[PDB]
Assembly symmetry: C3
Homo-oligomer: 347 residues x 3
């Protein structure tokens, strides 16, 4: 929270956290210090009785490498928008894709989970993305309480140079063409919710030529999710079928993929919040003889102790169930277990 300005209908919210974090793992690419911090600003201005303008900015700053290292900070979110009361809201910039409106229900683990597992950042509309225009409608205007739907469009994010280039070029793993997404969530009963999400994007020419894995003109995602959040109990499950949209590590994309996440949590009155979860990502029809491969598969057990709204500490144990093989080695998929210890100050 930490509202630092609230004068003349203009509110400024300064949020962020400092996370002293350490990983223990046989994977040397993962083991070691993981300390980082986040800094953010939420701003809001009242234009008239029916119109409110807003903007948000979220910045990730790593603190686990030296003062001469490179690329230690990056923007997670940055968008400006207008809210027209019950009509809805629209914003554009770097924001979360609507697919995350459902898959975030399982992104509640102490440390692991979320982007970088079954889905990644800058991975079409599955997570945070560049240049997304998002329309959101709350409670179906004034009709149905708990019914939310969103419509989203994303412009092409092409290559660095060449015919498929845009001003903000990237590598094939983080490219996209013109695409759209839609999400729909409803609370059938108190504490129980169901959600659906769909996204369809054009694939770029470099995605079909540079990597060895993944061929197709369109990336598609079908997502369904459930949530129970009542009586100090949190239960969430999420199943997604992707087409030419799930990353197969360094090697490319999977032609088809089935991702599944499920998590169970309980919140004690004195602050402890133990958590158990299972995540898997099944790839199908891979090129170069890989065929059907496990991209992700692990069981997560951990807990978080909340001192208050500004301080917490946690332990997270990722029990990796992947078997080391040619695919995991060539794609760069980690198969070792990791234990995470964190102490977080939030503001």
């Amino acid at each position: 929270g930490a509202e630092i300005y609230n004068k003349d209908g203009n509110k400024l919210d300064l949020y962020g956290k400092i996370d002293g974090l350490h990983y223990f793992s046989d994977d040397k690419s993962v083991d070691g210090d993981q300390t980082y911090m986040r800094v953010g600003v939420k701003g809001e201005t009242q234009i008239n009785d029916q119109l409110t303008g807003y903007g948000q900015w979220e910045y990730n700053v790593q603190a686990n490498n030296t003062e001469s290292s490179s690329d230690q900070a990056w923007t997670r979110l940055a968008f400006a928008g207008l809210k027209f009361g019950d009509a809805g809201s629209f914003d554009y910039g770097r924001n979360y894709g609507v697919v995350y409106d459902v898959t975030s229900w399982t992104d509640v683990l102490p440390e692991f989970g979320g982007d970088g597992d079954t889905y990644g950042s800058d991975n079409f509309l599955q997570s945070r993305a560049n240049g997304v225009a998002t329309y959101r409608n709350s409670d179906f205007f004034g009709l149905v309480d708990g019914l939310n739907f969103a419509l989203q469009y994303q412009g092409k994010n092409g290559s660095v140079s060449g015919e498929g280039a845009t001003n903000n070029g990237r590598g094939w793993s983080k490219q996209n063409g013109d695409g759209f997404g839609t999400s729909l969530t409803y609370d059938i009963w108190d504490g129980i919710s169901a959600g659906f999400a769909y996204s369809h994007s054009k694939r770029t020419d470099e995605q079909n030529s540079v990597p060895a894995l993944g061929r197709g003109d369109n990336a598609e995602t079908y997502t369904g999710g459930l949530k129970y959040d009542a009586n100090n109990i949190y239960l969430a499950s999420q199943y997604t079928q992707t087409y030419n949209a799930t990353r197969a590590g360094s090697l490319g994309f999977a032609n088809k993929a089935q991702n599944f996440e499920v998590v169970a949590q309980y919140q004690f009155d004195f602050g402890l919040r133990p958590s158990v979860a299972y995540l898997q990502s099944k790839g199908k029809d891979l090129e170069r003889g890989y065929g059907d491969q496990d991209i992700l598969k692990y069981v997560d057990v951990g807990a978080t102790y909340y001192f208050n709204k500004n301080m917490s500490t946690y332990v997270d144990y990722k029990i990796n169930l992947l078997d080391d093989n040619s695919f995991t080695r060539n794609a760069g998929i980690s198969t070792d277990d990791v234990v995470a210890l964190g102490l977080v100050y939030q503001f």
Copy 2:
């Protein structure tokens, strides 16, 4: 604005904007998402009845690329200074060159214009620069503002012409100075003049193919009308070895001209029309006289209030594609910009 601290005579101002921006162009180096944000801090402390100290920092953060991209943020401004009441002020750090005291009068377009057009950043004293010492005097000890500015050498990465903060030839400079003078002859009518003289580095005279000379010079004159919901501003600058000729180097001499007309409606709409051109002369490699920049700008901005706005800007590029534009990398396509800005 958004002053967040004001206790015991010390004020701290937190300003900035978040700009959801998108470009439409046949030029692939320009087309696509352009979302960025800026965050800044203005600080002021009162030392005594006649002395006030201050510092400012302005930071640009791009938001149009991935979380693994590189060089997405940079400092636009960072300087500390002392104010001697009405007598004037002195400050040092990364600040605008005094040439911008006049050329900023035309830097009022919805999206385009300013640095990156007839002049650039780190381009001698034309815009934001490193290591500038600036003295400013108000009402000339009335209504007449004068500035004297000095900039230390900003050399190469290594070699004889190196400094601790080395750069490439396009953004290098030697020891230089500038001076500016603006006056309001009538209510709402202003005239300005600016001069700049800098030593050029050896790499600027050896590495690029275009531009040869020991000194960079700038002569600028400007007019501005700002009254009755009407804004009119014009600016003419003649440079010598100071206007960039794209990737190829500098123009030996160049004539830049900017003019803009705007109207502010009471309900928030602000349409804008402008014309910009950059004529390079006496270029090497057989180029001779070349158009570096030439376009007509039309657009408008709607201000919801002091914290929220939306704008569209259309750059009608009048440059003809030829050997010079292709080799220098100068865009000749049109650009359309759509933006939604939150300010704090």
Copy 3:
């Protein structure tokens, strides 16, 4: 200072400085504009009567290069911690090594001194380091007033690739293995203090193979310091003996080294604060025929004028006493004088 939030027992402090700085030197790697700024956040939350949580973040942003330059900003500090009253405190993240608890007594020069001289940043536990767990006890609980001790542990910070790698790899100069440190300072009077510091770390494989200078499995530092700070007079001395821990420029580490810093200052009532100091770093038993070599040696004279608590200006003159030879030339150690002019706004 500049506390911007203080509500419901949660305080947020926003600090920093803007330093308009210029160096004059025959050394082209040092001469020119050195303008930079610092921004920091100090946060504190009260959990209960006996427990307080906190976090701090410090960010360095250079302003002396262009808007197209690279790696102009980096994190100096980022850690989260808990205070259990008189029992002590613990924090983890990027923080100062306990050796600096003593050597900071001489880090009081107008511009020079500190990191980059006898010791550097990311240099085992001598200065700011990644992934340090620090326990600190003040006044020996409540029993011995003015007696402070600290115990510190640092995990391995290995290479970018290979067997000795961690997730946050660096080059050999800023690598470390598992290490620990301890510090002890006592205030005999309110202005007279004595301090001791010890540090022991395992060395990485790249530190013994890539550089030409410095061989050994363990890095050690022994530090003792004296300080007088009363009656507008500041006197401080610090002597450190290192083993395979002092950097010998580009060539590697010194097998053993003796560092000495001494500084004398006086504070006038009208704001002027003249300063004189001497710093030296004597290397011993260097390979390739270097033997005993001077790594650092200069006399510092300067002054700082404080306008108030938020504005200051200073001049600092480094009179370099190093003679140019084969070692200084090959290691890249500057032997020229430097004059610094600074104007600082603080918030």
